[PDB]
From Swiss-Prot, chain A:
Binding site for Zn(2+) 2: 119, 123, 129, 137
The organism of origin for this protein: Homo sapiens (Human)
Gene behind the chain: MMP13
Annotated protein name in UniProt: Collagenase 3
Residues carrying covalently attached carbohydrate according to the record: 14, 49
Binding locations of Ca(2+) 1: 25, 100, 102
Protein localization: Secreted, Extracellular space, Extracellular matrix; Secreted
Family: Belongs to the peptidase M10A family.
Induction (record text): Up-regulated by TNF and IL1B.
Domain notes: The conserved cysteine present in the cysteine-switch motif binds the catalytic zinc ion, thus inhibiting the enzyme. The dissociation of the cysteine from the zinc ion upon the activation-peptide release activates the enzyme.
Disease: Spondyloepimetaphyseal dysplasia, Missouri type: A bone disease characterized by moderate to severe metaphyseal changes, mild epiphyseal involvement, rhizomelic shortening of the lower limbs with bowing of the femora and/or tibiae, coxa vara, genu varum and pear-shaped vertebrae in childhood. Epimetaphyseal changes improve with age.
Domain of life (superkingdom): Eukaryota
Curated annotation (Swiss-Prot), chain B:
Effect on the protein of changing residue 120 to A: Abolishes enzyme activity
Organism whose genome encodes this protein: Homo sapiens (Human)
Residues represented out of the complete protein: 104 to 269 of 471
Disease implication from the record: Spondyloepimetaphyseal dysplasia, Missouri type: A bone disease characterized by moderate to severe metaphyseal changes, mild epiphyseal involvement, rhizomelic shortening of the lower limbs with bowing of the femora and/or tibiae, coxa vara, genu varum and pear-shaped vertebrae in childhood. Epimetaphyseal changes improve with age. Metaphyseal anadysplasia 1: A bone development disorder characterized by skeletal anomalies that resolve spontaneously with age. Clinical characteristics are evident from the first months of life and include slight shortness of stature and a mild varus deformity of the legs. Patients attain a normal stature in adolescence and show improvement or complete resolution of varus deformity of the legs and rhizomelic micromelia.
Tissues expressing this chain: Detected in fetal cartilage and calvaria, in chondrocytes of hypertrophic cartilage in vertebrae and in the dorsal end of ribs undergoing ossification, as well as in osteoblasts and periosteal cells below the inner periosteal region of ossified ribs. Detected in chondrocytes from in joint cartilage that have been treated with TNF and IL1B, but not in untreated chondrocytes. Detected in T lymphocytes. Detected in breast carcinoma tissue.
Residues the record lists as binding Zn(2+) 2: 119, 123, 129, 137
Binding site for Ca(2+) 2: 59, 91, 93, 95
Annotated binding of Ca(2+) 3, by residue: 76-77, 79, 81, 99, 102
Domain of life of the organism encoding this protein: Eukaryota
Protein name: Collagenase 3
Glycan attachment sites: 14, 49
Region of interest (Interaction with TIMP2), ranges: 73-143
Modifications after synthesis and translation: The proenzyme is activated by removal of the propeptide; this cleavage can be effected by other matrix metalloproteinases, such as MMP2, MMP3 and MMP14 and may involve several cleavage steps. Cleavage can also be autocatalytic, after partial maturation by another protease or after treatment with 4-aminophenylmercuric acetate (APMA) (in vitro). N-glycosylated.
Length: 165, 166
């Protein structure tokens, strides 16, 4: 027999993502680089592996959308809700959606896609918000990056550290 | 930090259920009897008790639906996905949905509702799929043709690991 796990977490280390569509605001390459770096934040401190699929069904489906976009969390135009992502699970679980009524950037202007994506992917992997104001998973955005201790502790609580050196 | 913690089991032994709507394929009485028997599979081997509510919110809300039916886990027409149920927890937790593009039956012409429901309610109570090929919670539907059903030992052991014996 098997009972359910104690926390929402992926029951496998090999995860896939797919960039289903792209923002007007940045080039394809910039978007791909930001998402790759954002996944690496998490793979660097766990045993998780992330592989990009160009089509088909990936664990973490990533998309840019506005207003109603096919779930219970419609976007709301400029500002306000910026993005959201679902906890680990089937179907919409793990998926990450970015409001394309925001301005996404590879800079300090607008909202930095890498930083927001890293936080989203924390949700995708099973972290909720943190009360540590210095954490990546703190619920409020403020603009090299090094994953804060609180987030390391949280993600390792789910998946272990992988190779520690 | 915070994670998303799962409710590993119901923290009360007395649970309610509600049959929200009914399949075309069976009479109301047949549906009621199938679900009552499916809950009895589990209450017979634990301290869990199940009571039916006719109105309002119940712990285990049961419904029949097709395609996209309100939870963004859509059904898929005949065959494939037959039903799904959510683990213990508030709101949709415990609830069970049956794909009404299947043919549900009290016997063998289609999918026996009692058998599938008993499996669903395993999920509702905190059991995932078993690897024991003879288990109720082993995820392949089969039909013995026998008039009596005995809960396999793997499932007894699994549910008692959560709730203890009767
Ligand atoms: O994730 C998304 N939200 O929290 C939504 C709420 C929807 C939701 N809630 C819970 C859940 F599990 C899933 N979705 C609110 S928001 O305004 O769109 N949100 C604010 C916080 N954001 C952020 N990003 C980077 C960052 O780096 C901090 C650092 F720079 F220090 F690293 C700090 N916050 C991202 C965008
Ligand atoms: O429960 C539902 N599913 O598993 C869905 C997947 C959605 C899902 N996955 C996990 C979870 F926790 C919740 N929901 C798949 S399915 O094809 O619809 N399906 C349901 C009925 N299954 C079955 N197996 C044996 C049996 O008696 C076996 C016996 F006769 F030997 F006793 C009676 N039903 C076969 C598998
Ligand atoms: Ca997914
Ligand atoms: Ca917005
Ligand atoms: Ca419920
Ligand atoms: Ca189906
Ligand atoms: Na935009
Ligand atoms: Na039907
Ligand atoms: Zn969305
Ligand atoms: Zn967040
Ligand atoms: Zn459903
Ligand atoms: Zn199942």
């Amino acid at each position: 027999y098997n009972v359910f796990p104690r926390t929402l977490k992926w029951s496998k280390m090999n995860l896939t993502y797919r960039i289903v569509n792209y923002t007007p605001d940045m080039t394809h390459s910039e978007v791909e680089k930001a998402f790759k770096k954002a996944f690496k934040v998490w793979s660097d401190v766990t045993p998780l592996n992330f592989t990009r699929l160009h089509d088909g069904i990936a664990d973490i489906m990533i998309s840019f959308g506005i207003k109603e976009h096919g779930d219970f969390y419609p976007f709301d135009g400029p500002s306000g809700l910026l993005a959201h992502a679902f906890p680990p699970g089937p179907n919409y679980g793990g998926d990450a959606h970015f409001d394309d009524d925001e301005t996404w950037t590879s800079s300090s202007k607008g909202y930095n896609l890498f930083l927001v994506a890293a936080h989203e992917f924390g949700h995708s992997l099973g972290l909720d918000h943190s009360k540590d104001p210095g954490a990546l998973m703190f619920p409020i955005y403020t603009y090299h990056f090094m994953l804060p201790d609180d987030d390391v502790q949280g993600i390792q609580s789910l998946y272990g550290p992988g190779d520690e050196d």
